[PDB]
Design an enzyme around this catalytic site. Structure first.
Site, PDB file in Angstrom:
ATOM      1  N   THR A 288      -5.534  -9.964  -6.076  1.00  0.00           N
ATOM      2  CA  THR A 288      -6.238  -8.882  -4.847  1.00  0.00           C
ATOM      3  C   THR A 288      -5.632  -7.487  -4.594  1.00  0.00           C
ATOM      4  OG1 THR A 288      -6.704 -10.974  -3.918  1.00  0.00           O
ATOM      5  CG2 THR A 288      -7.032  -9.014  -2.713  1.00  0.00           C
ATOM      6  N   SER A 289      -6.573  -6.758  -4.385  1.00  0.00           N
ATOM      7  CA  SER A 289      -6.033  -5.259  -3.584  1.00  0.00           C
ATOM      8  C   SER A 289      -6.771  -5.322  -2.253  1.00  0.00           C
ATOM      9  CB  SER A 289      -6.532  -4.181  -4.325  1.00  0.00           C
ATOM     10  OG  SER A 289      -6.066  -4.097  -5.608  1.00  0.00           O
TER      11      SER A 289
ATOM     12  N   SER B 205      -1.659  -8.167  -4.627  1.00  0.00           N
ATOM     13  CA  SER B 205      -1.209  -7.567  -5.696  1.00  0.00           C
ATOM     14  C   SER B 205      -1.243  -6.140  -6.180  1.00  0.00           C
ATOM     15  CB  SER B 205      -1.367  -8.353  -6.932  1.00  0.00           C
ATOM     16  OG  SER B 205      -2.806  -8.411  -7.383  1.00  0.00           O
TER      17      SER B 205
END
Ligand SMILES: [K+]
Ligand SMILES: [Mg+2]
Ligand SMILES: [Mg+2]
Ligand SMILES: [Mg+2]
Ligand SMILES: [Mg+2]
Lengths: 196, 204, 231, 241, 222, 244, 243, 250, 195
Positions: A1-2, A129
């Site tokens: 994920t962002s 991440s």
């Protein structure tokens, strides 16, 4: 994920990509990582999908029971409930959660909760991440008291770059706007954000 | 130290025309050492037959457990348990020990006394029901039994023919497995008569 | 009458008879006196025997180096409560490196006695206690009643005929409060106080019990030939 | 006669403690009323603030159990609040466990089951309260379900509770005989509230100021109570007709 | 296993293959991976075979009791919530990977559940060892506003992709269609594209081929 | 507190009797009579149903006679609901013994344990005793045919012939009169029915108001058979002895 | 009858006589009051000086919960302490989970539910205290009074104990004469006057006055005791009014 | 605190009576009449819907309840006690049978489990007996149709036909005259309606009467198709309209 | 522990059990009796983990003796063996299982037949004409397969047993210090002193 959440003049906006993975396989390319724990208190989820869902469900329950007895909870209160679960079960959890809400007294607020279960109140927060690749960009571009359009562009450009570099991020950019006016859902597709 | 292959053994069941057959070997060993050549793996509760392969202590325990449960069933229900119902009981009982299971490969065989339909079923060590029209296999020579049954079997065999097929399936499968053999028993089951035959096989 | 079967029952006028009956056990107990100045706090206790062949029931118990009490009523109940105080004083020392305030000691006893007056099956404590101590705010004297009520005082007395000593101390208030830096005189005032509660019997050497705590004095008890000085 | 002190049967098969709990219901001397519209469910209750020293805003017998469910109580406030807190907790747990909002009738059954237990188990007394639950259920529409100390519960077209409940009940019965329908045929909740107050005035024979009443309204996706000025606005509308 | 779920106009359809394996061995050539939780809520299951059966039965049992208690038809989100919380509690040790679908008073629904407790929402989903073969087909041929017959075709095509291309999947295609306002239709062995060819030879033995030592009548009566 | 409402079910009277046990026996004395008679080649169990209604389903009914295992049965006198609690316990106990030792449970061992459970309710727990008296009829390879009885006190005794429930005093006198040791099963069947017929509170003894059972070695060679009589079989045996 | 012998038993009226009997214990106790003001609350209590031997200022009866709530009570003093101990546990767990200090209405119900629970079983006795309490939270000032039954309401002014009627009458005059509001410093003075006026109903033993207050402006929203110059000023104001 | 009532509230009196059970039966006597009749191809159970108020919606209150697809229950006595017994009865059918054998329990055994629950309320600490008598009608493959009565004591008896509650004595006599072993289900429904009219005083229609049958399998009520062995519930509640149709040819 | 043997002949069961108790590089004892009398006509030999063996044997002994007193009756060898098996079958899934292997030799007085049961620590029971636990079986089973006959006398059984001990003394790595031999028959249990 962002994921990220950003405060601005009229309130706060949450943002997220839509990718879920098992290894290098994308298990879901249209995930919704922006999640309602109360009318105008939402969270961004990163880490284990099972953990963050189970936590968010418990928090939503807690705040619903809070509201029944004491009325609308503060954003700080919501963050405290997230913290309590994350901190006390730190050995068994992989959850990085950003809590964001709109009060009328306190306006927009953002609390980030990393792995250990610590709480940090910030003007804006990035996590997941893909956040690693935009620390430089976001720090250079964030201003306080931005407009709605400016804040949307800031999140759009930021997550666009996070998605570009992080393999674990991708899909659409979802956003949730929290103001006095209400709750607005925004979506942005690859064809727009990729060529920014 | 793999619980399912310490003692050795096999069970196979087949359906025929208005009949079922269930067969097992007689070996009980401790790895390489053959200990007993009288260890039967097929039991029955009323007209429902149950064969069990795997760890011999669990074979004995589960027999005693199902005798227990079917005896209480009969007292309360005032009738003998049927194969379909017994199959469900076996599945429930095994899944009850989900995270500390009996190391067994049970096989149900019998004829429903109401409908007259032949019924066979197989289970993994933790209760998953494997129903079949044709045959069920179990034990340390299950691969061999799968190969024998899949080629030798044909539907609607007469009791006397079915006996030959299931016996040849067991015998030739057992002779390719070090831990299976040392004698064999075959049960031929008709609606209201059951014949039990001991087979002559090689004793190595 | 119909409302005294247990502690969990209120009477129609709002009384707790079991608590009142526990209070009655204190009245039957032998007299004990407590008083203090600004530097020291003193306990005086009249001990009671079964007959001439028996010993004299000890009335005073040490709780810490800076705290202790005297008892009147059921002695085993005083043992339970004093043991609790010993633990609480001790917990404060081990965990916080802090001498337990005499006021907190009173609050803790109050709350322990109270729980025994609101639940079925239990009974009230059948003993009254006079707690003396010296802490960070100077000398103290407390009066514990098994109703739960704890009271801080300059001086007091509990037991049979305690009203005599209590009246005396009420008259002597202005005198004994200013006996600072003089232990023997503060004891003398306490021994004279308890003498106002005597009938047919007088203070003998194996009859009198005195305790003292203060600024430069740990809680220490005097019996036998050590109290002959004060007769 | 200890069979009258705890919830065991008397020789005639009765539970006196349950019966006496019913009499505690009227201890507050307040009358409540509930009716259904097309889109809404309105509940009204008398508000008596005798002491001048009371903060009138804190005196209430209507509770917001969940976002969708409201509950009015007839009975002493301690038991009323005991029931309210449990109902809130039950509704919250239901939503967490089963993934959708607890229906008004299901909550009513659950609270009724709890009340039933107190009639059978000795160590627990019955609560001296009657609980009227209201909502606009997403399946059943406008709903009124009522619970009592016996553990009984049932749905209602409309209902009333209190000392002068019978007068209000027959008044409503006579209206529904006339209208020939199960509800108040009205578009806005404002006029259904006006109906509720109008018919309470007729049945009780008393006039109401803005502070003599308490109003709860259930619509789709929310239950809310009215302010004194919301009621005053409503009282003016009745008077000008 | 290969399992899929596809939404359409007026409801939802799920499908599954029928192979059950023990290592490289096919244990069951025609097992049922479509599970009834309630009359109009069905579950496709991949993973540990006994786990998907047991967890589906348990929640199905509790859903029935809940439906009786509430006097309401059960909702898919209730089955979803109950399954995910049970699976989360067991931290993945109950190896059930489920596609939950059905119709209820709220509408038609399609979800997926992972052994660890995470749930997804989608118009099309696939799980199991053949999910990549299936998803490839779904991503190629799915569109918005599918009809009933189009969705069945797409679902069964996605399962076939698994049957042919995944060694973990094989044999037949089961289907279950859940349409709004209608009864759910369970289509057991909807496609059977793996029928065994005629054997070259009958292996029926001459009677007396097997050597016998003893015979005896077994008593099954009382 | 709750002391106020405690009946104190497990205390002694000044005379050294257990109130509740005595009162439970008084309850049992109003229950339908049940008789057990032990012969050299089998055992008879006979019991009278409590005042029957003509619309009662008689064939699919069980009230008095229950099967514990293949070798043991009981006749009940008292509260049926109480008896079923105990019967299920006894059934389980028999299966535990079989599972443990791979042998059918000796009759006395089963009787002792069931009686020990009853005893417990009279000494601790503050609960009312079971209002039940059993007649146990069974066989094992140690003592052969055996009759026992247990009552709410948890005391049990062995018998050649015994009755429980109503009119035991009259019933026992009649059994004591006509019973002899070399008796056969078919003779015992007749004695059981004749005794009920004379002690009954009803006008006349009919098939619909009876439950009957035999435990014989009348199977084929060295094994025991339990026969719970069907309605028609009771009708026939009642005619065969000339009662109707 | 016998309905009054056991707690949680309903009489034929629908009453719990045991609770009504606990109220008699409250009526027997000393007078305590609470006054709500512009931006806070004021608490006061009558302390009977039984003897010269009582150390002045050193038998404190008003109790603080958390840092923003004050509690005072009349009746069985130990029962009141037990209630406050629970109140402190309730307030601690609220702040633990929700971060923000417990709101006064929220706190009021925590005590209410707990006291109400002691009317549900025969194995416990009802509380022998009425408790006046309150403070300042995010929504301003709140004053509450809680009774043995578990009943509580919000109050403009509250009173309980032996001189409750005298105090109530005096409280009603303040409400009538000050519709716009009373200031914190004024309320402290008035509290002193009312305790002195309510002391006429307990005038054998003379007494000691004890006051506390929470005010947004005067105490910064925290509970503090009134001592020294402000206390003596309030005592003098009260002395001038009785004569 | 805590349940200090660990002792029996039902005890034997000197005469041998169990007082609370007797008094529970008295509560059942006061209760509204309900009945059950067993036909050759089905079972019918029926009762009057005594409305508490005309403003009350009597449809929301169900006296006849489905326990399993092939078993139904009705009662006389205390409604709340019945409601919780139905909840418990439905659950025990799953926990102690369906979750073990993968099929629904036969009538006699479900009845046996309900009886056990009611017996325990007669002996366990700090509880009163249930103030209800149940009539449980059901079907199962090996026993066919059956009808059982369960009393507060926990005793149960199988019936060809019976009635319980207010006017049970008269109703039982009425059923004795009409019942034979050749009754078809429709004949049993007819007799049920006749028997009930005697005990009912006010309105007698499909809105004041509650009636359900245990008969043929209902595939239309199953909710799905595709499994041949699953053929639908034998329990069916007759509609208000279906009752009125039979009241014309009465 | 180590060597335990059993032979069932026509009229008796003969148990032979090694006398050595070795710990480390030391033979601590050479006269150890690895057996317990469970009842007058039932004998149990044992081998396995140190401590576990005697603790388990005596625990079984106590239970059988308790039964004998309670019922005034001797359990059959079959009944005793089934009780023992179940105890070991429970044990194997305990926190710390009994690591004990047993042979049960008994004379059934009701059947007038000798009976030999072999049970391992897992709870694996078999009735046998001859049995052995541990490495002993790897020599004795094949030997007995050859020389054993079902109709042998007690004397013939003892000679057959001497043949087993001789073979073990020739081919076994460890010195087990001979065996104690006991006979179970109609007259009960007796020990052969000169072996
Ligand atoms: K399968
Ligand atoms: Mg990417
Ligand atoms: Mg081989
Ligand atoms: Mg009660
Ligand atoms: Mg072995």
């Amino acid at each position: 994920t962002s994921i990220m959440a950003v405060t601005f003049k009229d309130g706060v906006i949450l943002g997220a990509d839509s990718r879920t993975t098992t290894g290098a396989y994308i298990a879901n390319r249209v995930t919704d990582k922006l999640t309602r724990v109360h009318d105008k208190i939402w969270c961004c989820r990163s880490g284990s999908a099972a953990d963050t869902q189970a936590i968010a469900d418990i928090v939503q329950y807690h705040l619903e029971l809070y509201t029944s007895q004491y009325g609308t909870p503060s954003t700080e209160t919501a963050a405290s409930v997230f913290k309590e679960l994350c901190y006390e079960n730190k050995d068994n959890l992989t959850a990085g959660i950003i809590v964001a809400g709109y009060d009328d007294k306190n306006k927009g607020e953002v609390y980030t909760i990393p792995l250990g279960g610590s709480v940090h109140k910030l003007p804006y927060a990035i996590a997941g991440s893909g956040s690693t690749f935009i620390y430089g960009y976001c720090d250079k571009n964030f201003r306080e008291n931005m407009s709605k359009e400016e804040t949307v562009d800031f999140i759009k450009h930021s997550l666009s770059q996070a998605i570009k570099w992080d393999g674990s991020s991708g899909g659409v950019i979802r956003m949730v706007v929290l103001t006095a006016a209400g709750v607005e859902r925004l979506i942005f597709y690859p064809d727009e954000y990729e060529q920014l | 130290s793999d619980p399912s292959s310490i003692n050795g053994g096999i069970v196979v069941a087949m359906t025929g025309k208005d009949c079922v057959a269930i067969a097992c070997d007689l070996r009980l060993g401790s790895q390489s050492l053959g200990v007993s050549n009288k260890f039967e793996k097929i039991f029955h509760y009323g007209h429902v037959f149950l064969g069990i392969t795997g760890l011999a202590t669990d074979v004995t325990t589960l027999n005693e457990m199902f005798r227990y449960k079917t005896n209480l069933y009969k007292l309360k229900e005032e009738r003998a348990i049927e194969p379909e119902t017994f199959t469900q009981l076996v599945s429930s009982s095994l899944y009850e020990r989900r995270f500390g299971p009996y190391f067994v490969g049970p096989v149900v065989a019998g004829i429903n006394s109401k409908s007259g339909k032949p019924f066979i079923a197989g289970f993994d060590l933790i209760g998953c029901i494997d129903e079949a029209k044709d045959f069920i296999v179990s034990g340390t020579a299950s691969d061999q039994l799968f190969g024998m049954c899949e080629s030798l079997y044909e539907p609607n065999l007469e009791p006397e023919d079915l006996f030959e097929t299931i016996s040849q399936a067991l015998l030739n499968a057992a002779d390719r497995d070090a831990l299976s053999g040392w004698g064999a028993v075959v049960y031929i089951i008709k609606k209201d008569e059951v014949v039990k035959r001991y087979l002559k096989m090689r004793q190595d | 009458n119909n409302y005294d079967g247990d502690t969990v029952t209120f009477s129609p006028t709002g009384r707790l008879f079991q608590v009142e009956y526990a209070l009655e056990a204190i009245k039957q107990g032998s007299v004990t006196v407590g008083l203090r100045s600004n530097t020291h706090a003193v306990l005086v206790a009249l001990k009671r025997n079964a007959d001439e062949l028996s010993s004299y029931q000890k009335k005073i118990i040490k709780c810490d180096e800076h705290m202790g009490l005297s008892l009147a009523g059921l002695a085993p109940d005083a043992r339970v409560l004093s043991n609790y105080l010993r633990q609480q004083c001790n917990y404060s020392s081990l965990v916080f490196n802090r001498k337990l305030a005499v006021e907190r000691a009173g609050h803790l006893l109050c709350d322990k006695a109270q729980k025994n007056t609101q639940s079925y099956g239990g009974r009230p404590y059948g003993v009254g206690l006079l707690i003396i101590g010296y802490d960070k705010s100077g000398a103290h004297l407390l009066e514990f009643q098994p109703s739960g009520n704890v009271t801080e005082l300059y001086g007091t007395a509990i037991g049979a005929r305690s009203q005599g000593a209590k009246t005396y101390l009420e008259r002597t208030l202005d005198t004994f409060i200013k006996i600072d830096g003089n232990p023997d005189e503060l004891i003398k005032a306490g021994v004279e106080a308890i003498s106002q509660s005597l009938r047919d019997e007088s203070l003998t050497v194996d009859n009198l019990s005195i305790a003292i705590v203060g600024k430069d004095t740990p809680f220490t008890i005097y019996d036998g030939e050590a109290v002959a000085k004060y007769i | 006669g200890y069979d009258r002190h705890i919830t065991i049967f008397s020789p005639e098969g009765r539970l006196y403690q349950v019966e006496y709990a019913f009499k505690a219901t009227n201890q507050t001397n307040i009358n409540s009323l509930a009716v259904r519209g097309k889109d809404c469910t309105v509940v009204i209750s008398q508000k008596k603030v005798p002491d001048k020293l009371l903060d009138p805003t804190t005196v209430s017998y209507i509770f917001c159990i969940s976002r969708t469910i409201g509950m009015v109580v007839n009975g002493p406030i301690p038991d009323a609040r005991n029931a309210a807190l449990r109902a809130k907790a039950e509704a919250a747990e239901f939503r967490y466990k089963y993934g959708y909002d607890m229906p008004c009738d299901v909550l009513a059954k659950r609270m009724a089951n709890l009340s039933q237990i107190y009639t059978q188990r000795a160590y627990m007394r019955p609560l001296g309260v009657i609980l009227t639950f209201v909502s606009v259920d997403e399946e059943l529409g406008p709903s009124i379900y009522k619970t009592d100390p016996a553990g009984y519960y049932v749905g209602y077209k409309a209902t009333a509770t209190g000392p002068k409940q019978q007068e209000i009940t027959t008044n409503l019965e006579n209206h529904f005989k006339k209208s020939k329908i199960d509800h108040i045929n009205e578009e806005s909740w404002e006029k259904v509230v006006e109906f509720a107050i109008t018919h309470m005035i007729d049945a009780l024979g008393t006039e109401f100021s803005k502070n003599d009443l308490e109003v709860g309204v259930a619509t789709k996706d929310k239950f809310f109570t009215l302010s004194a000025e919301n009621i005053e606005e409503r009282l003016v509308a009745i008077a000008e007709q | 296993t290969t399992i899929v779920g596809v939404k359409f106009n007026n409801g939802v359809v799920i499908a599954a293959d029928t192979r059950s394996t023990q290592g490289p061995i096919v244990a069951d050539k025609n097992c049922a991976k479509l599970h009834r939780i309630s009359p109009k809520i069905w579950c496709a299951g991949a993973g540990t075979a006994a786990d998907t059966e047991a967890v589906t039965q348990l929640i199905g049992s509790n859903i029935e009791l809940h439906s009786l208690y509430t006097s309401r038809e059960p909702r898919v989100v209730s089955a979803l919530q109950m399954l995910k919380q049970h699976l989360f509690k067991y931290q993945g040790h109950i190896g059930a990977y489920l596609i939950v679908a059905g119709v209820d008073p709220t509408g038609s629904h399609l979800f997926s559940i992972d052994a660890h407790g995470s749930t997804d929402v989608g118009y099309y989903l696939s799980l199991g060892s053949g999910s990549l073969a299936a998803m490839a087909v779904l991503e190629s041929h799915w569109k918005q506003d599918l009809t009933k017959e189009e969705a069945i075709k797409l679902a069964s095509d996605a399962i076939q992709a698994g049957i042919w291309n995944d060694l973990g999947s094989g044999s037949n295609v089961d289907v279950c269609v859940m349409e709004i306002g209608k009864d759910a239709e369970y289509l057991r062995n909807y496609l059977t594209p793996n029928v065994r060819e005629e054997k070259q030879k009958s292996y029926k033995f001459p009677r007396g081929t097997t050597a016998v030592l003893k015979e005896s009548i077994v008593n099954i009566c009382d | 507190g709750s002391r106020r409402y405690d009946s104190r079910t497990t205390i002694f009277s000044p005379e050294g009797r257990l109130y509740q046990v005595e009162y439970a026996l008084e309850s049992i004395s109003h229950a339908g009579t049940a008789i057990g008679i032990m012969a050299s080649d089998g055992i008879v169990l006979a019991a009278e149903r409590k005042v029957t209604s003509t619309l009662l389903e008689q064939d699919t009914s069980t009230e008095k006679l229950y099967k514990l295992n293949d070798k043991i049965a009981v006749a009940v006198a008292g509260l049926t609901a109480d008896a079923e609690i105990l019967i299920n316990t006894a059934r389980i106990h028999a299966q535990n013994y079989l599972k443990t030792y791979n042998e059918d449970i000796p009759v006395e061992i089963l009787v002792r344990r069931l009686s020990d459970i009853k005893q417990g309710y009279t000494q601790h727990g503050g609960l009312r005793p079971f209002g039940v008296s059993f007649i146990y009829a069974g066989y094992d390879d140690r003592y052969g045919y055996q009759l026992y009885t247990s009552n709410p006190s948890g005391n049990y005794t062995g018998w050649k012939a015994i009755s429980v429930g109503a009119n035991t005093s009259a019933a026992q006198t009649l059994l004591q009169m006509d019973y002899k040791d070399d008796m056969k099963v078919d003779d015992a069947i007749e004695l059981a029915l004749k005794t009920l017929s004379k002690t009954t509170d009803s006008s006349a003894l009919t098939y619909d108001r009876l439950e009957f059972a035999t435990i014989r070695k009348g199977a084929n060679d060295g094994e025991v058979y339990q026969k719970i009589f069907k309605p028609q079989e009771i009708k026939d045996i009642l005619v065969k002895t000339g009662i109707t | 009858t016998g309905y009054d012998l056991s707690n949680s038993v309903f009489s034929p009226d629908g009453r719990n006589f045991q609770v009504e009997y606990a109220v008699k214990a409250v009526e027997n106790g000393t007078t305590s009051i609470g006054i709500k003001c512009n931006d806070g609350v004021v608490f006061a209590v009558e302390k009977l000086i039984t003897s010269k031997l009582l150390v002045p200022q050193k038998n404190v009866k008003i109790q603080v919960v958390d840092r923003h709530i004050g509690c005072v009570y009349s009746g069985l003093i130990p029962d009141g302490r037990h209630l406050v101990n629970r109140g402190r546990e309730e307030a601690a767990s609220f702040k633990k989970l929700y971060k923000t200090p417990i709101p006064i209405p929220a706190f009021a119900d925590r005590l209410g539910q707990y006291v109400q629970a002691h009317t549900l079983y025969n194995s416990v006795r009802p509380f022998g205290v009425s408790t006046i309490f309150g403070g300042v939270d995010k929504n301003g000032a709140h004053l509450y009074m809680l009774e043995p039954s578990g009943s509580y309401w919000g109050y403009k002014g509250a009173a309980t104990g032996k001189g409750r009627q005298s105090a109530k009458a005096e409280l009603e005059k303040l409400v009538d004469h000050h519709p716009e509001g009373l200031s914190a410093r004024e309320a402290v003075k008035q509290a002193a006057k009312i305790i002195y006026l309510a002391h006429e109903d307990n005038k054998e033993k003379d007494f000691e006055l004890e006051i506390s207050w929470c005010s947004l402006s005067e105490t910064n929203g925290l509970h503090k005791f009134v001592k020294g110059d402000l206390l003596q000023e309030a005592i003098d104001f009260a002395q001038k009014e009785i004569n | 605190m805590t349940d200090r009532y660990s002792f029996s509230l039902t005890t034997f009196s000197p005469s041998g009576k169990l007082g609370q059970i007797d008094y529970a039966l008295t509560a059942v006597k006061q209760g509204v009449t309900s009945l059950g009749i067993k036909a050759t191809n089905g079972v019918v159970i029926a009762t009057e819907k005594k409305s508490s108020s005309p403003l009350a919606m009597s449809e929301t209150l169900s006296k006849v309840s489905l326990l399993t697809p092939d078993i139904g229950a009705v009662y006389s006595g205390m409604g709340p006690d019945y409601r919780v017994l139905v909840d418990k009865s439905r659950k025990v059918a799953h926990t102690s049978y369906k979750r073990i054998y993968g099929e629904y329990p036969p009538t006699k055994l479900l009845v046996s489990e309900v009886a056990k629950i009611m017996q325990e309320a007669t002996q366990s600490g700090g509880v009163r007996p249930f103030g209800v008598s149940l009539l449980i009608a059901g079907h199962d493959e090996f026993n066919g149709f059956s009808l059982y009565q369960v009393d507060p004591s926990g005793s149960y008896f199988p019936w060809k036909a019976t009635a319980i509650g207010k006017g049970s004595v008269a109703a039982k006599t009425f059923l004795e005259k009409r019942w034979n072993d050749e009754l078809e289900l429709e004949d049993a429904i007819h007799i049920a309606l006749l028997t009930l009219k005697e005990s009912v005083e006010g309105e007698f229609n499909g809105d004041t009467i509650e009636l359900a049958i245990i008969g043929d399998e209902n595939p239309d009520l199953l909710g799905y198709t595709g499994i041949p062995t699953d053929k639908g519930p034998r329990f069916r509640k007759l509609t208000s309209q279906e009752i009125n149709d039979r009241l014309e040819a009465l | 522990m180590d060597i335990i043997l059993g032979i069932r002949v026509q009229d008796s069961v003969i148990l032979a059990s090694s006398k050595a108790v070795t710990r480390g590089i030391s033979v601590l004892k050479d006269s150890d009796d690895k057996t317990r009398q469970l009842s007058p006509h039932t004998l149990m030999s044992f081998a396995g983990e140190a401590g576990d063996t005697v603790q388990f044997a005596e625990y079984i002994q106590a239970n059988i003796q308790l039964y004998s007193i309670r019922e005034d009756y001797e359990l059959s060898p079959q009944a005793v063996s089934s009780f023992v098996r179940q105890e070991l079958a429970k044990s194997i899934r305990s926190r710390r299982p009994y690591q004990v292997n047993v042979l049960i030799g008994g004379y059934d007085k009701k059947k007038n037949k000798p009976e030999l049961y072999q049970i391992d620590y897992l709870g694996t029971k078999v009735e046998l004409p001859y049995g052995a636990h541990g490495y002993s079986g790897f020599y004795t089973f094949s030997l007995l397969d050859h020389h054993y006959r079902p109709d042998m006398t007690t004397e013939e059984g003892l000679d057959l047993l001497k043949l087993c001990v001789q073979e073990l003394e020739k081919r076994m790595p460890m010195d087990f210090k001979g065996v104690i031999v006991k006979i179970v028959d109609k007259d009960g249990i007796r020990q052969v002193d000169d072996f």
